[PDB]
Ligand binder design. Structure first.
Ligand SMILES: CN(CCOc1ccc(C[C@@H]2SC(=O)NC2=O)cc1)c1ccccn1
Length: 263
């Protein structure tokens, strides 16, 4: 490894993505872990009683449905943030507009679960920008099939968080996921692939500098890119079950359009 014009540009790219990341996302991993460890306080929701008291304290029908709808609305909101961030990725807006919409379409959920890991520990998940904390066991206490909803996410998060990536690692990682040339229905694959190769170089450089304690981190991360897709995959199958069983759930129409091409 050498300090040359190429690597200097890669460092500039990483710094740029990090700045955009900080501006695009309200709650960083750095601020999130501090809260999760008290170094800073959220209303903890751990049972039905604290759930009701909490809906009345934190500034945000049947309980399971309310919660599930809360996740949908948070999700739609996140799509907005992810989109704003994607536009700051060098080259992204110069792509054919349809490919931009396609990339985001097949990428937002992978990123959503990536970033949700930052807000999780083994006990639960931060909600409403850190105003609240909903416990893992409370989510499992929700009636079938909603009690199985979040558990794959927690399991992924616990493994992912062991990698101990920080926000400047995640800033590049999320860009790499977005610029996947293998999404269905892309018009111009090569320019997309060119940008990702560049992002992947920046990412490898970043991990080497930022994590001197591990030479396996880059390969472990590329492996996680696949776990993510499986989680989306597994999540849509569970969505069909919710449909072919319970008619009292109205799925947000924006998400509907995304899930159309995910079946
Ligand atoms: C558990 N939390 C935190 C958010 O946790 C999430 C879990 C899953 C998603 C994916 C959504 S849900 C769906 O089916 N399709 C999507 O895009 C998005 C967020 C909340 C948040 C608000 C109210 C109640 N609880």
């Amino acid at each position: 490894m050498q300090l040359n014009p190429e690597s200097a540009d890669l460092r500039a790219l990483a710094k740029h993505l990090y700045d955009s990341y900080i501006k695009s996302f309200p709650l960083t991993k750095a601020k999130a872990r501090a809260i999760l460890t008290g170094k800073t306080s959220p209303f903890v929701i751990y049972d039905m009683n604290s759930l009701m008291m909490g809906e009345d304290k934190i500034k945000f029908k049947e309980v399971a449905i309310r919660i599930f709808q809360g996740c949908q609305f948070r999700s739609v909101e996140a799509v907005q943030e992810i989109t704003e961030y994607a536009k700051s990725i060098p080259g992204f807006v110069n792509l054919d507009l349809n490919d931009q919409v396609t990339l985001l379409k097949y990428g937002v959920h992978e990123i959503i679960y990536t970033m949700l890991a930052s807000l999780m520990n083994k006990d639960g998940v931060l909600i409403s920008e850190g105003q609240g904390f909903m416990t893992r066991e409370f989510l499992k206490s929700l009636r079938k099939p909603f009690g199985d909803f979040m558990e794959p996410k927690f399991e992924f998060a616990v493994k992912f968080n062991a990698l101990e990536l920080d926000d400047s690692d995640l800033a590049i990682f999320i860009a790499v996921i977005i610029l996947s040339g293998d999404r269905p229905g892309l018009l111009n694959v090569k320019p997309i692939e060119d940008i990702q190769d560049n992002l992947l170089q920046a990412l490898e450089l970043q991990l080497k500098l930022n994590h001197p304690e591990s030479s396996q981190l880059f390969a472990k991360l590329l492996q996680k890119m696949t776990d993510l897709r499986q989680i989306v995959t597994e999540h849509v199958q569970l969505l069909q079950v919710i449909k072919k069983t319970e008619t009292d759930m109205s799925l947000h129409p924006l998400l509907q359009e995304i899930y159309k091409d995910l079946y």
